[PDB]
Symmetry: D2
Subunit: 388 residues, 4 copies
């Protein structure tokens, strides 16, 4: 009825999102840089809960130890002044030329050691600022050509790096967990761990798998043509959805990072339905870029729209699930039977059950319609607010 | 020099590949059906090692117990007459209308029980014929719309089904392992476990994960725009490449199942390089469809081309890796350093190493070229046989 | 407020849409065949304006001249009984095995002559039934491999065929125009004239270009990742939008033919906005397939949803364009300036205008935001009915 | 046998290709800038025929009239010193922030006038340097959202701009023609005239269509999943292939601009076959970016590989077409019949020919295999140099 966000809705934004200056591979910046303190103050006014950062967003690369302490103290004063929190942080292992062949899986061993030391330094800072999750996006881990990267050796190096970071946080006694953010390509021709599935599988080979989960991004799974709500369901089923990046993407192309709600709107509806019905309690983080057509007024408009669209879709998904006509349709399509075990009676009783094979009437079962189109049109009517 | 296959090269083909009659979603069959016995005899003449089958390829659906025994005895005589083996089998849980919403994850519980009984019946037959691997492709597990399938409940049902099949083979004492074949879409709008990564992650949640691996198909990972050699490397790293389906695909579109070598030729080269250098010893199985433009002479031509193209690429990948100029290029691009541990000295020594951070010269490291373009042009010259 | 269609809304459906039996490349039919007369009666009850057909949907292939007249007279009685019209017809040049390498561009010359005679026979029947548009979808014109089809010779053959059909209708004095329906792939690996742009360009090389336009389909341009409203705008700008096929598609994959509104919902909104604001007056034709999960009740539900979703989106697009806040936003984003000529003053005056170059303040112009994100969030609020 | 290029092979390169500094949307430059004079000298040593440029590659933006004359005179001396030619030039209407919503179709009218004056200034310079073709890539013409751009008004503005440029060159008496370069997306969410087909159709609506053709780029049509050799065939059939940009792309993703031969190798083979057999006589221009992993030695290696791979593929395509076994296969697949008119006897004789319908044996025609798989395996053997 009213779609105004409050800090209770847990909306967070990266400093690099509203602060994106608009440089793209074919053009110069269209906006001046934003001071982090200014972004914190503006986002607080719009109803945000908190902000996230890469090390190099907060502390310019090369900074002396004294300049570092000064940048952090200004930031911390803005947080104290506004009540904003810092629930997640991450490391920039992709912008500087030294990371051109990767950080953790760079072929040069000295670069891999530097990447780990740069990361550990920022984990300490994140803990100090209260973050609960530390994200890793290995944007430069990958290759443009087949012989440049032995992927088995590279996964050994990736496992080695995350194992060492797990050793580090446990030896320091820190309460922080790691989340890997997959992306299939860009800026490398193919990036390692390209989808939520590949990241979940990798984590199971780590020495302390309980410290690691995923940080999926809407547009990145869509760059592989995959269904983002399905991949989130698999991450929830595994107990590994530690954080999430929300935005929009129009299909398979360069990573657009549009505001949330833009892109595939029906997928956004089914994602919000799933997060709210599964009781996801982490931050609703927006990793988006206000288009470079916009001035600063359009940056804040686009950030506000992220939050607005989540809250509209939350309302429509809740209306859908509460509608008694929809609940009857779900039974007509046998979603209740999907949730019942196939064979709680056990293997032997299944083998002995003639009604499951010898005397199963396949033709009668085949003729039963699933009634999915009526259910989906109810979902469409709810999304569009056209119910009668 | 000569590219003639022998049974030692372990090339296998599904009965459904050369026996595809050419029916597609817009047209009728263009070829008559092939008797399985005829396919076994023809494939043996071409140098194949063996064949694979779905239950319903070998025994027509509905078959009485007596017709069943007759179909199998004819098949077995053809195997004995030719020396052909049967290393893999699988179940058809996708053609009959009863499977229109899935087999293991159908919303109707009675269909899920029937799907398990149909599978178990064919596992017994596979063991009898000597198969070592039992493949599952869940082509109908999935959805066209968001509300039709709760994916968390569906993954519970999928895990329940594979857990019961594992219970079955272990209680029977059978030496057979399972391999899941991913596909991202088609015939369902989105299929569950859509990529090698999602399947590997799922397997780790099974009660007896050691019995399950993957059966990746070249064209299916390419339908998601992903790099198939990279996904195979991840499956090999996990110890889970139990079988493989070889074919060709021209990018993101319907599943073409072209002959191996067609489609993305450079990816085929890097796949053969990887399988041969990792010492993959399972079958080289072709899951392909001779185009419906062809008569039976073109079917056998297309099957022969599958094997020929593997053997040419095997030769060119071996020439590449043996060339001393390539070995020097690999060192110039630091592939040797990629295989060395980043920090065998351990965490504490890494933290104490000033050369890894405080005194690391990032600018000097950044200026080092990786020399990947020269290496990739050596790989291209080898593939095209243009070395001088 | 109420979304009930009437024949005045001009909604039409192909006989092959609601009559699709559910056979797909991996499974058997799940529905029995529908008698055309039954489909006409049911669609009339739902508020449809008319139906369209391929020759072989109405008259089974091989039909004797006497069976033919009988099938047509039954159909015509159903049309008379219901008030349903037949505004478009088309030819099936894709199902029968003889068309496996194409109809108009088959390499065999005798098949190309047969394809033309089969087409001409149905044009006469279409005129008799009152159709105004004759569609051609060359689903089999194309190739799976490079050497199979010289595309320059094939375009000569395609032009030859359409030129002969134009000669035929003009010599007969018929008032019917042709519309080419593009599709980029499936069932051939690549289809000729794969997008609206390629079809529009081809038409300009025909001997009588005024007789030919396009029949774009939502999901087909989306199978190439393209923006369907943009391609429709280009077809309208050229004066060539003779008919349109409405449906839904979830990105780049096999042709789903979902009901209209499903798939990319925001693109559907912008398409309806464009058709209604440009005053498109032809039929709103649905080329869709009710999913094979459905029984006949779900078929009619899915057909009804096509019409419902058009009417909801029509209402929301009209509300958007009528909102004075949106009209002010359009001026803020300078859509009014886009519609003014760049240089009605002419070339010489442009060259003499120092304000266009020598004294143009580029920095001041660059700093002007375009305000597109606020406009797009107004469009989102209107679509979701969340305006306040 | 030897693959050394000479200026006779007409290979050309943009200054922006070898001079790309490696800045991408997620990272800083990895190479220093190259002086244009140095690039001309190095490319001449490698066997190139000439170079191309944007205005802003040669003359830094903002340059005073005196600095301008100096930059051009240095360049011209390098051309004279090396024998290098300048066959094409183009305008940068995409890098500066003023072009953030387009050049010719920017919503702001003053920006559209500036874009035309910037273009005309560089056409004069191109003519002075001897260029024959002037390319336009409208990289910023397009939109991220639906309401931001009325595409019909934008195409009016695009036509207005190209009509004025045609007026300009004709009134000046210049012998130069224009070529539009399509791209479907990036950096805008959708770009206008996204494919070769849309550009060819647009040109037919210009006032003097004979002055305009296309400049297709391999990777751009592949970003839409389309077959680049087919689109080139359509451009050749229309008489509109005025220039071509050669490079490589691995499927549907961001524009990679890899060296020619990388990406889809079989498509490169069929493209070279087509250009050489159609007798394309324009420049073989490489629009590529040496990956940012490389130092300057890798830049020159990658440029050399462009030329090498064209010359290898030229040899293999010529061997294919000259092989008598291939010529017999082409007849077996009836490529000779494809080139014969379908009905040179005319419409009336076709209607009177009972052998084309009443007495056509469709079943006999349908059973004829097309023998395309054998032909395609001959093409594969030739490409890989595996003929015996
Ligand atoms: O730019 C690095 C930020 O961190 C990750 O979330 C990325 O997706 C990206 O937006
Ligand atoms: O048709 C079912 C066969 O089994 C699986 O390997 C599928 O990919 C398919 O080719
Ligand atoms: O099946 C042939 C019908 O005619 C065309 O409109 C196609 O898109 C299709 O739906
Ligand atoms: O960067 C602008 C150059 O000109 C055009 O050819 C583009 O494709 C591009 O490489
Ligand atoms: Ni992103
Ligand atoms: Ni992100
Ligand atoms: Ni396949
Ligand atoms: Ni397979
Ligand atoms: Ni379609
Ligand atoms: Ni259609
Ligand atoms: Ni490009
Ligand atoms: Ni280009």
């Amino acid at each position: 009825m009213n779609y105004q966000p409050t800090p209770e809705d847990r909306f967070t934004f990266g400093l690099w999102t509203v602060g994106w200056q608009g440089r793209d591979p074919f053009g110069d910046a269209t906006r001046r840089a934003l001071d982090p303190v200014e972004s914190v103050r503006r986002l607080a006014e719009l109803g945000a809960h908190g902000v996230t950062f890469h090390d190099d967003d907060l502390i310019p690369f090369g900074s002396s130890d004294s300049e570092r302490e000064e940048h952090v103290k200004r930031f911390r004063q803005a947080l104290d002044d506004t009540g904003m929190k810092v629930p997640m942080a991450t490391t920039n292992l992709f912008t500087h030329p030294v990371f051109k062949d990767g950080g953790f899986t760079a072929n040069d061993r000295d670069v891999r050691r530097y990447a780990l030391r740069k990361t550990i330094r920022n984990i300490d800072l994140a803990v100090e600022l209260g973050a609960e999750t530390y994200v890793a996006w290995g944007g430069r881990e990958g290759a443009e050509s087949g012989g440049a990267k032995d992927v088995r050796d590279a996964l050994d190096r990736m496992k080695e790096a995350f194992d060492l970071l797990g050793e580090y946080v446990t030896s320091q006694g820190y309460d922080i967990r790691f989340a890997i953010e997959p992306k299939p390509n860009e800026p490398r021709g193919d990036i390692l761990l390209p989808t939520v599935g590949h990241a979940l599988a990798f984590i199971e080979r780590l020495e302390r798998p309980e410290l690691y989960g995923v940080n999926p991004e809407v547009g990145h799974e869509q760059m592989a043509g995959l269904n983002f709500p399905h991949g989130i369901a698999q991450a929830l089923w595994a107990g590994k959805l530690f954080h999430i990046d929300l935005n929009g993407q129009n299909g398979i192309k360069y990573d657009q990072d549009l505001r949330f709600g833009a892109g595939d709107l029906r997928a956004a509806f089914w994602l919000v339905d799933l997060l709210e019905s599964a009781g996801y309690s982490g931050p609703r983080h927006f990793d988006f870029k206000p288009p470079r057509t916009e001035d600063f007024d359009g940056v804040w408009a686009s950030a506000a729209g992220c939050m607005r669209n989540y809250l509209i879709l939350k309302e429509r998904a809740a209306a859908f699930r509460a509608d008694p006509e929809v609940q009857e349709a779900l039974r007509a399509s046998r979603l209740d039977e999907l949730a019942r075990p196939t064979a709680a009676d056990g293997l032997q009783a299944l083998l002995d059950d003639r009604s499951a094979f010898e005397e199963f009437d396949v033709d009668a079962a085949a003729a039963r319609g699933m009634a999915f189109e009526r259910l989906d049109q109810l979902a469409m009517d709810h999304l569009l607010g056209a119910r009668g």
